[PDB]
Amino acid sequence: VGNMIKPMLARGELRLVGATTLDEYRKHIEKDAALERRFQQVYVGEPSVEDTIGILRGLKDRYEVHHGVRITDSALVAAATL
Amino acid sequence: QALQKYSTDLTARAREGKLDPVIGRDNEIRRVVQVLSRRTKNNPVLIGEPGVGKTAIVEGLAQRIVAGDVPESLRDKTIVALDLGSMVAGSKYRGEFEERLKAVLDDIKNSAGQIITFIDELHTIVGAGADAGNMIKPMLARGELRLVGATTLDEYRKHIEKDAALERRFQQVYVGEPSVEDTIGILRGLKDRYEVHHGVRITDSALVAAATL
Amino acid sequence: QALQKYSTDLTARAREGKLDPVIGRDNEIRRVVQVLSRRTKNNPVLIGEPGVGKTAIVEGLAQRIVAGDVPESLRDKTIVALDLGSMVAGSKYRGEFEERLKAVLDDIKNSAGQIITFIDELHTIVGAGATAMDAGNMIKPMLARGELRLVGATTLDEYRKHIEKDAALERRFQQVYVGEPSVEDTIGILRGLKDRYEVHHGVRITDSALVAAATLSDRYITARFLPDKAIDLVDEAASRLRMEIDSRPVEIDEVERLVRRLEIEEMALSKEEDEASAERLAKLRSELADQKEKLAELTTRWQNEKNAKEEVGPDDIADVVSAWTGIPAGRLLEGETAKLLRMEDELGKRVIGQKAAVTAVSDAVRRSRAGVSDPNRPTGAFMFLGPTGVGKTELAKALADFLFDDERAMVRIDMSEYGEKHTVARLIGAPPGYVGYEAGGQLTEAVRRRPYTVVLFDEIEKAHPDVFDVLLQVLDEGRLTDGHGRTVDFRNTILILTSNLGSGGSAEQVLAAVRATFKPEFINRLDDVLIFEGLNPEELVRIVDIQLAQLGKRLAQRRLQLQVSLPAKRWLAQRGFDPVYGARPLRRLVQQAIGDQLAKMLLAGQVHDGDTVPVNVSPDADSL
Amino acid sequence: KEEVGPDDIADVVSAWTGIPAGRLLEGETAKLLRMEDELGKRVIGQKAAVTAVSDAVRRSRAGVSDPNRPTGAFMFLGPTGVGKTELAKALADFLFDDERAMVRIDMSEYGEKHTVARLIGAPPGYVGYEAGGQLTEAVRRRPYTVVLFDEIEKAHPDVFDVLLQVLDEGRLTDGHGRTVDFRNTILILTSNLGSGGSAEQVLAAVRATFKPEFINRLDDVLIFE
Ligand SMILES: Nc1ncnc2c1ncn2[C@@H]1O[C@H](COP(=O)(O)OP(=O)(O)OP(O)(O)=S)[C@@H](O)[C@H]1O
Ligand SMILES: Nc1ncnc2c1ncn2[C@@H]1O[C@H](COP(=O)(O)OP(=O)(O)OP(O)(O)=S)[C@@H](O)[C@H]1O
Ligand SMILES: Nc1ncnc2c1ncn2[C@@H]1O[C@H](COP(=O)(O)OP(=O)(O)OP(O)(O)=S)[C@@H](O)[C@H]1O
Ligand SMILES: Nc1ncnc2c1ncn2[C@@H]1O[C@H](COP(=O)(O)OP(=O)(O)OP(O)(O)=S)[C@@H](O)[C@H]1O
Incomplete structure (x- = not known):
């Protein structure tokens, strides 16, 4: 979206949860x-550096078994800021 | 079996009690009736x-x-409750929407004049062409179908x-917006539906303050 | 036989008499015939x-x-009568349409010039079946030799x-150009058609109704053409009358529904x-009781008239033309003639003084x-001017209020x-061909809807x-033309042109400043050029009363009210000084002298909701 | 205490549109009572003016x-470099805590x-039509600023x-024919008439520069010391 889902929607039997970008x-x-x-x-702008750092350090073990090398907080924060 | 997969029954829906209790607006219902009862x-x-x-x-x-x-x-x-979103939708050939529209019109005009029709947002009636939404005029201007509509000023x-x-x-039928008092009346009428949906209670002072703010 | 499958019949329907009779239009039918019978x-x-x-x-x-x-x-x-709709029902294959068209054509041709086909709305014949033009011109060869006759009727702007x-x-x-008929011929068309409706609805119709409909439908509904917008009024009137021979008439069913509503609400x-x-x-109790009284009174009057309204009259037409295109054109049914004769002292509640202007406006609304x-001229075009703070904008808004009950329904x-x-x-x-064109005009598309507003x-x-x-035509008659060329009607809207020319020179110098700031042919359009006059210290007391009424009504939202003593009531007006700034200084004075202290108290406790506070004067200010 | 109240609705209608419409919940009243002094920490001097603006906000x-008129239309003028623009900015900083949230x-x-x-x-039908007007666009959203x-x-x-009818009604009509409401803004317009002259030599400059139809619209004409 067209005119095919509005008669379905203004009746109360389905619940659609969509997503797109702002200008689009x-x-x-x-x-x-x-x-x-x-x-x-519903608005979700962007996480910040400190937040994506927490995201990374949460999502670290999965790759430490996918490849498995080692991880350093210095590397994580450097990736984030750079 | 023509207007059985391109239409529902708003009357049977209201019989099943699953509609909202309109409050007021008797002038416009009377006008709609004394128009729908013409020759x-x-x-x-x-x-x-x-x-x-x-x-x-x-x-x-x-x-x-x-x-x-x-x-x-x-x-x-x-x-x-007729609909065209599900008639022009699946058709990729020459002259295929016409067979469906003609089947619907034929099923209407076979039965007696007791299938009063309702197309909502009928500004979607002029398209479907490519000679569509235009074969309906010979039955419109003769009192064969009734076709209650609803459309915005702009559209x-x-x-x-x-x-x-x-x-x-x-x-x-110019349906003007209501005033604050009629709004309070309508709100007080509908209060119980929300009071039942959400397991809370709602105060009349809150309704008045809402209609005023 | 393919004809009997892809087309209806018309002469049969005529023989069994299902077609509404036809009246007049002799030259058109003669021309149609002499064309239909050529080589x-x-x-x-x-x-x-x-x-x-x-x-x-x-x-x-x-x-x-x-x-x-x-x-x-x-x-x-x-x-x-052909049907190009049911000729393309199923033709998803390649020739299933040309086959049917050839069948119908050769069947017409095998009839030795008997058939006279009639395609209604023949402008849909162009794109019969396409994919590159192949169809819709297969009859182009047969047309020239006059094989088929093909009478058709299509609109003009297509x-x-x-x-x-x-x-x-x-x-x-x-x-064969077909012009619209006049009222004299529409009356005849109606007089001939005044049987089918009179039968379909079990009622009777008076000739006065026909004449009044054929006149009002041309005077007021300026959007459609004459033979139809006239019949619609008669039809709706008869329908309403039949709906009233049902259990109860109008104006009582609505009151009983309203009473039941107020009951279920209380x-x-x-x-x-x-x-x-x-x-x-x-x-709510008072309203329920005072509407039930009127219910009982209407009931008793109906029982009287029933113990001691069977055909339409020349005023139900007016009621329909009032309910649609909401211009009011009834016959002053005794419910409001008192209001019209009271209009002066009814407007005096919002404007004080300026009886000269109130009289002019009241006259132009009454007459x-x-x-x-004048039936083709606006309802009046006033330009009233004077010094500031005198009440011209207020008078205009008060007039719109008295007329519509909603100040937000005029065009400003x-x-x-x-x-x-x-x-x-x-x-x-x-x-x-320019940027803003699909939205049309603004004043024009505001007036074109609800053409009873005040401008x-x-x-x-x-x-x-x-x-x-641009306003010359608007004031001379009721016509203005936006970009699309269409014309709106200003015949029944009250124009008003405020101003400030000649601030305070004299009651005559301004009549030499206006004539120098305008043209000679613009002043000529207006009605009386009303001149307002300043205020007198005796007239500001009632203004003080009005301002205090306003302030109390606005305070009644927090269930407060005041009790003002005559000392302060006349002190305020005694501070309506400087007869150059009108009456706004009085409003700013009321603010500065009451509202600040009232708020200061109100948000500092001690004035909790409910109890009224009395205001009493002091040597210089006034305390609460 | 498990039912909606007549102030939760005000809470909602303030939770969007930014308008502080309510019934003076606690803390807010303490701030309003504590305004003349709280505003003094940024505007030293000018005792007469701060009281006026404070009383306007209080009312x-x-x-x-009056629900249909702006929340105040003050025009204060005086000698050069006294703190007029700075008083306006301090006000906007008071009731928003965002110095860049006003429309100057x-x-x-x-x-x-x-x-x-x-x-x-x-x-x-002209070049910039679908873009609108700067002021009207800025005010159609954020209907609480300090113009x-x-x-x-x-x-x-x-x-x-144009201000001649922006004031006294809070009305304005842009290109598309829309209407906007200034009914809850605080219009503020400085000047530099006078320049040394006494209060009766500048109150002649105001009269000889503007018109009665204009000076009659706006509220008290504050003079700065
Ligand atoms: N008189 C009334 N009685 C009861 N509910 C009403 C009344 N008027 C409006 N409402 C409610 O207000 C809302 C209006 O929704 P709809 O009328 O269905 O929308 P709409 O009028 O079709 O406008 P569009 O063009 O579809 S966006 C619904 O929740 C109705 O239940
Ligand atoms: N000379 C006439 N005698 C009797 N009734 C007439 C006459 N002229 C028009 N009418 C009536 O006026 C109305 C006009 O209807 P139509 O002529 O069928 O509409 P139309 O002229 O086909 O316009 P369109 O574009 O096809 S909708 C009908 O109710 C006719 O019965
Ligand atoms: N005769 C009056 N009766 C009641 N209130 C009045 C009267 N004259 C003035 N007022 C008050 O004064 C206010 C200002 O008057 P307005 O008519 O709005 O100003 P105006 O007459 O348009 O003058 P200009 O030229 O436009 S500044 C009104 O809103 C009323 O509150
Ligand atoms: N009472 C005061 N409190 C705080 N700062 C003040 C005060 N009086 C003057 N100032 C300072 O004086 C400087 C000039 O203030 P502004 O208001 O910006 O000048 P202005 O009032 O706009 O004068 P003009 O006519 O526009 S040049 C700023 O740095 C203010 O901080």
């Missing part, structure tokens, strides 16, 4: 939609 | 800025029919008024 | 605006064939959108374990309901922004002296 | 103010007639005929 959503769901009255926006 | 060219079209309840009037008419509060020549008519002006010879077959 | 290229195509009758002519021709009033060479021809583009085919068609609002419901329920006004344009000439396109739309022109003298020239 | 949020426009640029189109837009008019003495007396 502003394109296909604003001009030709007339449906935006039944869609609720 | 020729009986097709009302609910017009008004978006959000003010242009479908709620049609559900109200359905509930009133089910309850039996309508004039003599309006009982047991079983208004039908109406942009999509229909460019096709004047079709706009003639319609009647406008 | 080569005998194809009439009825053209003209939508609604004026382009199929009724063909059905009249069918009736005339059944009767026998046609010339010799048109005897017993059995007109047939004959140059689809067919005229293909002038190889259009050449084989003769056009019943469920009573069990409120709350305090904010005390003063909200005390009025239009009684049908004495600030002519202080139109300082540049080119900004006039903001209210007239941009020509075709208002703030600060007319600030605009460039070329915006003034 | 507007306490529940006694420099009236020093609009010495030309036609440059007004930046805060209105262009009529239908400012830096040194409104330069723009020759035609821009005074």
Whole structure:
């Protein structure tokens, strides 16, 4: 999105959870939609350096068995900042 | 078996109690009835800025029919929720949407004049062409189907008024937005549905403050 | 036999008499006949605006064939109506459409000139079956030799959108322009048609209704054409009347529904374990009782009239034209004539003084309901001017309030922004082929909907002296034309042009400044150029009363109210000084002297919701 | 204490649109009472003005103010370098804690007639039409800002005929024909009339420069010491 899911949706039997980008959503769901009255926006901008560092250090063991070499917090933070 | 896979039954839906209890707006229901009960060219079209309840009037008419509060020549008519999103959708050939549209029209006009029809957002009626949404006029301007509609001001002006010879077959019912007092009335009417859905309670002062803010 | 499978019949329907009778239109049918009976290229195509009758002519021709009033060479021809829809039902294969078309064509040809085909809306014949043009012109050879006759009727703004583009085919068609009839002929059409409706609905119809409908449908509904927008009014009136011979008439069913609503509401609002419901329920009881009284009174009057309304009259038409295109055009049914005779002292509640202007506005509104006004000219075009803070904008808003009950239902344009000439396109739309064109005009597409609103022109003298020239037609008659060329109607909207010319010179110097800031032919359009006058210290006391009423009504949201003593009430007006700034200083004084202290107390405790506070004067200020 | 209340709705309608509409929940009242002094830490001097703006905010949020008119239309003027723009910025920093969340426009640029189109837009059929107007776009969202008019003495007396109805109604109409509401903003417009003269030599400059229809619109004309 077209006109084939709105008669299904304004009845209360299905629940769709979608996803897209900001400007794209502003394109296909604003001009030709007339449906935006039944869609609720949720914003997820971007994590920060400190947050993606936690993400990395959470997701480290999986690769330490995939390849398996060694990991250093210095390497993680360097990757993040660089 | 023609209008069985391209339509539902809004009347039977209201009989199953799964509709919302419209409150007020008796002027517009009476206007819609005294238009839908005409002799020729009986097709009302609910017009008004978006959000003010242009479908709620049609559900109200359905509930009133089910309850039996309508004039003599309006009982047991079983208004039908037609749809075109599922007729023009799967068709990749020459002249295939036409067979479906003609089957629907034929099934309507075989039965007596008791299949009052309802297309919502009928600004999706001028397309389907490529000579579509245009073979319907000979049955429109003769009182064969009733075709209760609902469209926004903008879409109406942009999509229909460019096709004047079709706009003639319609009647406008300007559904203006309600005032604060009528809004409080409607809110107080609907309170119980949400009070049941969410296991909480809602105060009348809260309703008034909502309708005022 | 393929005909009997891909087409209906018309002469049969005529013989069994299912076609509405046809009246008038003699020259058109004669021309159609003499074209339909020529040697080569005998194809009439009825053209003209939508609604004026382009199929009724063909059905009249069918009736005339059944009767026998046609010339010799048109005897017993059995007109047939094709159907290009059911000819393309299933043709997903390659030739399943050309086969059917050839079948129908050779079947027409094997009939020795008997059949006279009739394709309704023949502008759909162009793209019969495509993929590169192959179909829809298979009848182009047979047309020329006059094998088939092919009478058809299509609208006027599509004959140059689809067919005229293909002038190889259009050449084989003769056009029969069909103009719209006048009121004198519409009256006859109705007088002849005034049986089918009178029968379908079990009612009777009076000729006064026919005449009044044929007049109002031309005066007011300026969007459709005459033979149809007139019949619609009669039909809806009869439908409503039949719906009233049902159990109960209107104006009582609505009141009983409203009473039941207020009952079901007061019943469920009573069990409120709350305090904010005390003063909200005390009025609902009053309203329920005072509507049930009217219910009982209407009931008793109906029983009287029933113990001591069977056909439509020339006023139910007015009620329909009022319910649709909400212009009110009834006959002043005694429910509001008191209101109209009271209009002066009813507007005096929001404006104090300026009885001269209130009288002019009241007269121009009154003498239009009684049908004495100029039928093609706006309902009045006033420009009232004077010093500032006097009440001109307030009077305009008060008039819109009294008329509509909703101040937010008038059209207000600030002519202080139109300082540049080119900004006039903001209210007239941009020509075709430019940026903003699909949205049309703004003032125009505001008036075209609900053409009963009030129009208002703030600060007319600030605009460039070329915006003034767009309003000449608007004031002379009710016509303005946006980009799309269409024309809106201003015949029944009350124009108002506020201003500030000649601040305080004299009651005559300003009548020499206006004539120097305008043109000689612009002043000539307006009605009386009302001149406001400043305020007197005796007149500001009532203004103080009004401001205090406003402040109390706004405070009643926190269930407070005040008790003002006459010392302070006259002190405030005694501080309505400097007869140069009108009456706004009084508003700023009320603020500065009451609101600040009231808020200071209110948000510092000690003034908890409920209890009223009395204001009492002091030597210089006033304390609470 | 397991049911919705008539202030949770205000909580929602303030949780979006930014408007602080409510019934003076706790802490907020302490801040409002503690305003004249809390604003003094950034604006030393000018005792007369801070009280006026503070009373305006107090009235507007306490529940006694005309719902259809701006929340104040002050124009304060005085000698050079006294703290006018700085008072405005300190206010905006007080009730937002974001110095860059107000909409200031420099009236020093609009010495030309036609440059007004930046805060209105262009009529239908001209170059910049679908973009809108700068001021109108900035105010249609964030309907709680603090509009400012830096040194409104330069723009020759035609821009005074848009504020003439921005004030007293909070109305403005951009190119597309829309309408915006200024009903809950605080318009503030400085100046430099006077320049040394007494209060009765600058109150003549105001009269001889502007019009009665204008001076009558805006609120108290604060003079700075
Ligand atoms: N008179 C009424 N009685 C009861 N519920 C109403 C009434 N008017 C409006 N509503 C409710 O308000 C909402 C309006 O939704 P709809 O009327 O279905 O939307 P709509 O009027 O079709 O506008 P669009 O064009 O579809 S976005 C629904 O939740 C209705 O239940
Ligand atoms: N001369 C006439 N005598 C009687 N009734 C007429 C006459 N002219 C028009 N009418 C009626 O006025 C209405 C006009 O209907 P039509 O002529 O069928 O519409 P139309 O002219 O075909 O316009 P379109 O574009 O096809 S919708 C019908 O109710 C006709 O019965
Ligand atoms: N006769 C009056 N009756 C009641 N209130 C009045 C009257 N005259 C003035 N007022 C008050 O003064 C306010 C300002 O008057 P307005 O008419 O709005 O100003 P104006 O007449 O438009 O003058 P200009 O030229 O536009 S500044 C009104 O909103 C009222 O509150
Ligand atoms: N009472 C005061 N409190 C705090 N800073 C002040 C005060 N008076 C002056 N200042 C400082 O004076 C400087 C100039 O203040 P501004 O308000 O920016 O100048 P201005 O008032 O705009 O004068 P013009 O006419 O625009 S040049 C800033 O650095 C302020 O911090």
